[PDB]
Amino acid sequence: PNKILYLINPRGFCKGVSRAIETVEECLKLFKPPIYVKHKIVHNDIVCKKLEKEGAIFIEDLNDVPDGHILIYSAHGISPQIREIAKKKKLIEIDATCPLVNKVHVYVQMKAKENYDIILIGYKNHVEVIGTYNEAPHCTHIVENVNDVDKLNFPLNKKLFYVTQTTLSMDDCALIVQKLKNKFPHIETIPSGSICYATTNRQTALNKICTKCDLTIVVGSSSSSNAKKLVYSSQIRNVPAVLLNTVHDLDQQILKNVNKIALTSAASTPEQETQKFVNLLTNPPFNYTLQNFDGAHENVPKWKLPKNFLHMIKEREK
Ligand code: F3S
Ligand code: NA
Ligand code: NA
Questions:
Q1: Which residues bind dimethylallyl diphosphate?
Q2: Which domains does the chain possess?
Q3: How many angstroms separate the CA atoms of 98 and 73, rounded?
Q4: Could you tell me the sign of the dihedral formed by the alpha carbons of 299, 76, 187, 237, in that order?
């Protein structure tokens, strides 16, 4: 019948990711490779491999970093402890933590100083969650599921504040929050919430269109949580979905009998990888008719690069 490819917007790079990439690229222009980055700068192998070629090196052990040298913190943020270590080595700290991850770090410190205990909804082994946790480790409690909620116990007078990983499924998050609120009715949180505009926007747009479709293709890396949550958002809405890093990974057999495809991409996914899908699917032998699907207009934040890094740039151009 009628074959259609719904190319969805918004999709692809968020501002935290573009800022983080530009931060690394701009360091490489100024200072001589190698440029050391703590953890993968964003969770996309294609982006990271390109930077490795250009002279970046992603490390987990700060001893792999020469004293006095540049170290960049990834978009996902970092534990405070890592920082004090950096200063001991007199490193040039260049912090590309996403402002909306920093937002969570900041509320956590602020509420802990007000003697709240903090509930952190997110996945225990995600670098973002670990980094946020370590801002107030002795008064924070991570929950990744509703079992963890049942286990929480606090005196009745104890003030509680919850916060979340920025890239959760809005559906799962709401589930856990609802259970949290049942148990702790007076629990407080960030008014604007912790789940970022990019996560909300990409899931919201996909959710609106996926139910007209037979298959959802999400372009992105399996190491990316928000990519995985896009796939999940489609599945719990009963439309099969797959996460693919690149067109080469597409098993073209799964397109047999699918006439309508919802196509989107994660916040860490380069637009070129998504275009290769559009090119493959809208041309022979597949001939899906291309249509755009627009969720609400996304307002792209006007974040600048890290200020100390900008100061450097200003100098050198003298
Ligand atoms: S937290 Fe920041 S890095 Fe992107 S996915 Fe959200 S804007
Ligand atoms: Na603490
Ligand atoms: Na705020």
A1: 43, 76, 126, 224-226, 268
A2: 1-13+196-298 (3.40.1010.20), 14-98+299-318 (3.40.50.11270), 99-195 (3.40.1010.20)
A3: 10
A4: positive
Question: What is the rounded CA–CA span in Å between residue 250 and residue 48?
Answer: 21
**How far does residue 16's CA lie from ligand 2's centre (Å)?**
27
Resolution expressed in Å:
2.2
Q: Which of 43, 196, 223, 265 to mutate to test the pocket of ligand 1 (most atoms within 8 A of CB)?
A: 196
Angstrom distance (rounded) from CA 89 to CA 85? 7
DSSP 261: E
User: Would you say the CB of residue 136 lies under 6 angstroms from ligand 1?
Assistant: no
Q: How many Å from the N-terminal Cα to the C-terminal Cα in the chain? A: 63
**Is 128 a residue of the active site?**
yes
State the number of CA atoms in the 13 A half-sphere of 108 facing the CB.
Answer: 30
8-state DSSP, 255: G
Q: Whose CA is nearest to atom 3 of ligand 1?
A: 16
Instruction: Say how far apart CA 153 and CA 139 lie, in whole Å.
Output: 13
- Measured from the Cβ of residue 36, the count of other Cβ atoms closer than 10 Å reads 21
Q: Residue 127 carries which side chain, given as an amino acid letter? A: V
